[PDB]
Design a protein around this ligand. Structure first.
Ligand SMILES: Nc1ncnc2c1ncn2[C@@H]1O[C@H](COP(=O)(O)OP(=O)(O)OP(O)(O)=S)[C@@H](O)[C@H]1O
Ligand SMILES: Nc1ncnc2c1ncn2[C@@H]1O[C@H](COP(=O)(O)OP(=O)(O)OP(O)(O)=S)[C@@H](O)[C@H]1O
Ligand SMILES: Nc1ncnc2c1ncn2[C@@H]1O[C@H](COP(=O)(O)OP(=O)(O)OP(O)(O)=S)[C@@H](O)[C@H]1O
Ligand SMILES: [Mg+2]
Ligand SMILES: [Mg+2]
Ligand SMILES: [Mg+2]
Ligand SMILES: [Zn+2]
Ligand SMILES: [Zn+2]
Lengths: 550, 460, 196
């Protein structure tokens, strides 16, 4: 119940920050005294809910030799009027007494909402009590104030101003590497069986917080007990120890626990996440591959030539082309190359968060990408922004609405020195306003054509990298016959053909064929159907000839 | 079967007090927009509970009847009989017994439907008795003879009756006639009792005399050592007013004396039993401070909640069968705000009493005019109860001499002699309280008083 | 921790205003007495947040020989009902006692929002306490009221009317010349290398 550094894992970069911010001024205040700067007393934690934010507090606090003074959010708000503000005054006097001191406040937004958006003056006093007492502190006190929340936007920003809270520290969703470590934290207390592959689990878990993983560990434990319920009689007052020794959680319990209500994670926000697709997994289009190697990889790798040449680059890249051409995966593979952070934003994600009005988060998309620089910001489904008013034809309203007017501010509100990059992608590029296509905003426009038969060969090579295909498969004879078919169409054929294979596989089981026959294919090849009209392409090829007329 | 307030019976005073509104009639006030048989907002008759009226008259709390007519509508009135709601609620801070929610008794079972509520010790907005009319200074001047000879404190019992006190509206006055004292082991700062032994006997005298145990008196008389009767100013603003052991011990006796009421849910409300402390003023003269525990302060002793501290101003809250929730007390800060402070573990004792006025008649005409008896339980000062005084007290060997029985101390001694039967002693306490000449001539012709003659014509 | 003129830099034109508005009536009230005009007692500071607005207060206040009183916005709003308005009355009596006086109020909008856009009457009292006590002052008091905010629009405009606050003083974003000076202020305490 007492937390060390080993009890938390995965968010190493974040803990590297806090040790510089909290561990460093306390065990060595002389360093800031020798260099002659002020120690930051404004450490702020934030992130998604249930992400160890309370856990990382004591992970730092118990690893000091400093005094610690815990302060919860609803505990003060539970108190009566006046007495609640007394405890804050009772807090800081003890911390300024025991001068090496740590003040952590969990759920800071409950005692500090926006003063504009609040009703009770008792809430307004305790905010005003907090704003007063933060400034009443001293640098000679050597007392560090920590605060955590899950809603960094609901806070009164006067705290987030200078002198009170300056150190915005986000706790992001961990990678499969770091969440593997988190599983090892919870399972090292657990009693498992030898079949348990956490690395298989951590690969199969993608958007989970540690609370989801701890519930995941707690879930598969229960199913292990459910298997033993036949051997366990509940009318007994104590079960025997032999079933306790056999109580070892199987890998299949986690396979059960991956398909349970546990999986329902918290992924419905504006997330930053490193991608997984690469250049080999996208067949063909090597010209625009190198164009991204030109336009976005050269700044993130070498800003030195720019200051050599005195020229800031174009930060605005627009993808366009026919639909179903893998344009979503393109920005993921290039962020996976130069290891930049990645933020996927779709069209209705703007709108559905604006039926609930999350537009500071839209600014925070740029801010977190500024916080996670180098980062690329990917705007999927830009036609949906036009389809917020139906289209450019639409309900007579064009692409421009409150979304565009927000984005044009935030795209122009980006420093050109920043390597934070914005990637736009649509399939209906005529149906977007040129105000967003304005130079400085989005001036690079990249057409994504259909592949040729060599590209369609390279896709079918790349798509079937994980499939047990047959040996007689002439993909080139497929690539000969597939001409007008998109890369989405080719994957759609394989989804048909695998379904045709399962119409042989489990048919044969009810009547292991891990091979995808020509008979599986020539049925789907006869059933093959083109999804893109060539007269639609003749539009895009005229745009590929010239869209700069606009 | 019936309600308690359909089977309990009020006092005759409570019968006298019900038929009055107590309304204070104004004549034509300031902003009259009417002829002399009209009305405006400023010439209505006034309320007994009217706070501006109580403020201008410097009256602290309204009476319990002025409280009664405030909190209740006039239609809700027990002459309805069946359809009556008792507005008064005797407090029940014990434990919801026979709980209708499946869980055990209070013991072994608890839920929300059986727990009592946390106590808000506000000041009680009313009191039972307003004025304490001591019917004679000679009632006191007899009573304080123990302190002038010894210097140690003294406890007693207020006896008498409750009458209308017309100076305040609907005022009940504790008319005080008599004092009896049980056996007790007396000390200086505190007093511990011996058990009282003739409990039905002295109560029978009050039943004869038409008195009853109307309250308690004791003393806090510490002479300040200058020889005049000045005290150490110890019961005042800066020190305290009530010792907290005195508060609990009186509430023990006050729980022993509730008052039946046709306006309360149990058929009883509050207590006729009152409390007086004889002390000294700032001026150095023998003063009196009269109080009574609040209906919470009775209940928290009945529900075993509060406890005295070393600080007499601080009252302890007892740590943990029972159920001790929050206690508060509403404050007035320096800008009038009401702050319910946490009373755990301690809190001021101010929120437990009510203040009472006290005095005398214009001229003493009590039910007792004679003072001839040495007081009981004072053999430590050689003041005892022996039969040999009656030869000089009732003057029986001087057989011509009239009846000196107008002395409750002696009437209990005559009742300690227990000679006169229940009708003849109620013919004695007829003549000992009313003094009728033909009924003294009847009693001087009765057999048992002539038996009380001829027995005490032959003693020494 | 005690601020002189040298500790602030860059906003010279703004400090040129305030010395005419605050330094000038205090060390020489005779000038307005000789010319026969009323000294402005309505100095108001505003600008973006975190722009030295609290810093320029003591930069003037410590450079007088005048008495100074300090009022924080949330400090009054932290207080209980009635008692918060008491401290304002306790403020001005001390300033009208020590007649060469400077009253700076940081974050004036927290004690003075719009009366149209507010909920608690306790907020409406302390605004009404402020509007009263500003007018209760005298020219013979020779007491200057300073106030700063980052939201000049959220204020009740009755303060910004005449007699109460007339001197709207904005603190703009400094030029690269002036912010160069600001860097020299912070780095002269710092220990640097020669490449800087
Ligand atoms: N990243 C993590 N690593 C390890 N354990 C974690 C992690 N995230 C959550 N947990 C566990 O789940 C619990 C959830 O508590 P916290 O995440 O610390 O609470 P929170 O993050 O402040 O979010 P709240 O409490 O819902 S507002 C922790 O106490 C841990 O037991
Ligand atoms: N050239 C391609 N190479 C590999 N996969 C492709 C290719 N073209 C399409 N796909 C697949 O098509 C699917 C959709 O990709 P997207 O980029 O979403 O298509 P899009 O061009 O964005 O148009 P939509 O409206 O989003 S389907 C994914 O499963 C891709 O793997
Ligand atoms: N122009 C400046 N010159 C020098 N230091 C400055 C300047 N602006 C800000 N600072 C520093 O940053 C701190 C911020 O305090 P203030 O700017 O005075 O607060 P504010 O301007 O009233 O805005 P708040 O407090 O967020 S409402 C100052 O105390 C200085 O340490
Ligand atoms: Mg938490
Ligand atoms: Mg797509
Ligand atoms: Mg400020
Ligand atoms: Zn009238
Ligand atoms: Zn119950």
């Amino acid at each position: 119940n007492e937390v060390g550094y080993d009890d938390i894992g995965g968010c190493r970069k974040q803990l590297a920050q806090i040790r510089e911010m909290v561990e460093l001024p306390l065990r060595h205040p002389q360093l800031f005294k020798s260099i002659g700067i002020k120690p930051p007393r404004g450490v702020l934690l934030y992130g998604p809910p249930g992400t160890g934010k309370t856990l990382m507090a004591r992970a730092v606090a118990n690893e000091t030799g400093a005094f610690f003074f815990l302060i919860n959010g609803p505990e003060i708000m539970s108190k009566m009027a006046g007495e609640s503000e007394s405890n804050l005054r009772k807090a800081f006097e003890e911390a300024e007494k025991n001068s090496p001191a740590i003040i952590f406040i969990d759920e800071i937004d409950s005692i500090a909402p926006k003063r504009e958006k609040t009703n009770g003056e008792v809430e307004r006093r305790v905010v005003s009590q907090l704003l007063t007492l933060m400034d009443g502190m001293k640098a000679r006190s050597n007392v560090v104030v920590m605060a955590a929340t899950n809603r960094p936007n609901s806070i009164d920003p006067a705290l987030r101003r200078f002198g009170r809270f300056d150190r915005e520290v986000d706790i992001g969703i961990p990678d499969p590497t770091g969440r593997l470590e988190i599983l090892q934290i919870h399972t090292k207390n657990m009693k498992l069986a030898d079949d348990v592959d956490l690395e298989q689990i951590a690969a199969e878990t993608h958007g989970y917080v540690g609370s989801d993983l701890a519930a995941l560990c707690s879930e598969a434990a229960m199913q292990q007990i459910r298997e033993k319920m036949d051997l366990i009689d509940l009318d007994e007052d104590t079960i025997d120890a032999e079933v306790l020794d056999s109580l070892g959680v199987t890998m299949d319990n986690f396979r059960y626990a991956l398909g349970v209500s546990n999986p329902s994670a918290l992924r419905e926000v504006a997330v930053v996440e490193v991608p997984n697709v690469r250049w080999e997994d996208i067949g063909g289009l090597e010209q625009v591959k190198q164009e991204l190697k030109e336009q976005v990889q050269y700044p993130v790798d070498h800003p030195e030539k720019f200051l050599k040449f005195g020229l800031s680059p174009s930060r605005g890249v627009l993808f366009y082309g026919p639909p179903g051409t893998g344009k979503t995966m393109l920005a993921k593979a290039v962020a996976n190359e130069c290891a930049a952070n990645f933020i996927s934003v779709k069209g209705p994600e703007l709108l559905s968060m604006w039926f609930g009005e999350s537009e500071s988060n839209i600014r925070d998309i740029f801010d977190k990408a500024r916080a996670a620089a180098p980062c690329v910001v990917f705007l999927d489904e830009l036609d949906s922004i036009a389809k917020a008013r139906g289209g450019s034809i639409g309900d007579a309203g064009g692409a421009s609405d409150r979304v565009v007017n927000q984005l044009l501010t935030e795209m122009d509100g980006m420093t050109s020195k920043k390597n934070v990059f914005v990637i736009g992608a649509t399939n209906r590029p005529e149906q977007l306003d040129p105000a967003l296509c304005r130079p400085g905003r989005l001036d690079q426009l990249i057409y994504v054509p259909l592949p040729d038969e060599a590209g369609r060969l390279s896709i079918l090579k790349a798509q079937l990298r994980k499939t047990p295909v047959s040996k007689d498969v002439d993909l080139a004879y497929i690539a000969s016959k597939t001409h007008g078919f998109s890369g989405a169409d080719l994957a759609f054929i394989t989804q048909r053909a695998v379904k045709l294979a399962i119409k042989e596989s489990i048919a044969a089981e009810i009547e292991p064929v891990p091979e995808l026959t020509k008979r599986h294919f020539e049925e789907a090849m006869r059933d093959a159907r083109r999804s893109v009209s060539d007269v639609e392409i003749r539009r895009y090829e005229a745009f590929a000839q010239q869209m700069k007329n606009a | 079967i019936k309600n308690p307030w359909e089977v309990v019976r009020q006092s005759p005073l409570d019968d006298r007090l019900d038929k009055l509104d107590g309304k204070i009639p104004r004549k034509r006030g300031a902003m009259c927009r009417h002829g002399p048989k009209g009305m405006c907002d400023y010439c209505t008759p006034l309320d007994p509970f009217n706070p501006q009226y109580l403020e201008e008259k410097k009256i602290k709390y309204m009476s319990v009847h002025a409280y009664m007519r405030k909190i209740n509508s006039a239609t809700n009135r027990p002459e309805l009989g069946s359809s009556f709601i008792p507005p008064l609620v005797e407090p029940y801070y014990r434990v919801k017994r026979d709980c209708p929610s499946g869980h055990p008794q209070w013991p072994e079972g608890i839920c929300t439907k059986c727990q009592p509520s946390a106590i808000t010790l506000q000041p009680q907005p009313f009191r039972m008795v307003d004025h304490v009319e001591f019917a004679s200074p000679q009632i006191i001047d007899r009573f304080l003879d123990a302190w002038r000879r010894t210097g140690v404190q003294r406890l007693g019992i207020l006896y008498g009756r409750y009458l209308e006190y017309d100076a305040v509206p609907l005022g009940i006055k504790a008319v005080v006639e008599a004092i009896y004292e049980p056996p007790q082991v007396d000390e200086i700062d505190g007093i511990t009792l011996n058990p009282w032994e003739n409990e039905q006997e002295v109560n029978q005298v009050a039943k004869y005399c038409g008195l009853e145990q109307v309250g308690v008196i004791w003393t806090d008389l510490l002479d300040a050592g200058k020889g005049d009767g000045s005290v150490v100013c110890k019961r005042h603003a800066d020190s305290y007013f009530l010792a907290a052991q005195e508060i609990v011990f009186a509430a023990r006796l006050q729980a022993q004396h509730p008052k039946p009421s046709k306006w309360s849910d149990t058929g009883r409300f509050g207590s006729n039993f009152v409390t007086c402390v004889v002390s000294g003023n700032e001026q150095g003269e023998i003063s009196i401070s009269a109080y009574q525990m609040s209906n919470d302060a009775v209940e928290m002793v009945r529900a075993d909640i509060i406890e005295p501290s070393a600080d007499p101003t601080l009252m302890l809250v007892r740590e943990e069968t029972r159920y001790i929730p929050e206690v508060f007390y509403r404050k007035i800060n320096e800008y009038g705000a009401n702050v319910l402070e946490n009373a755990k573990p301690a809190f001021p004792v101010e929120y437990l009493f009510v203040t009472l006025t006290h005095g005398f008649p214009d001229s003493p005409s009590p039910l007792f005019t004679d003072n001839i008896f040495p007081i009981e339980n004072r053999e430590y000062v050689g003041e005892a109860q022996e039969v040999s005084a009656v030869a000089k007290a009732l003057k029986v060997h001087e057989a011509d001499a009239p009846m000196n029985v107008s002395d409750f101390h002696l009437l209990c001694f005559i009742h300690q002699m227990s000679v006169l039967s229940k009708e003849e002693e109620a013919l004695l306490c007829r003549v000992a309280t009313l003094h009728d000449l033909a009924e003294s001539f009847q009693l001087r012709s009765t057999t048992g008083w002539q038996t009380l003659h001829m027995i005490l014509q032959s003693t020494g």
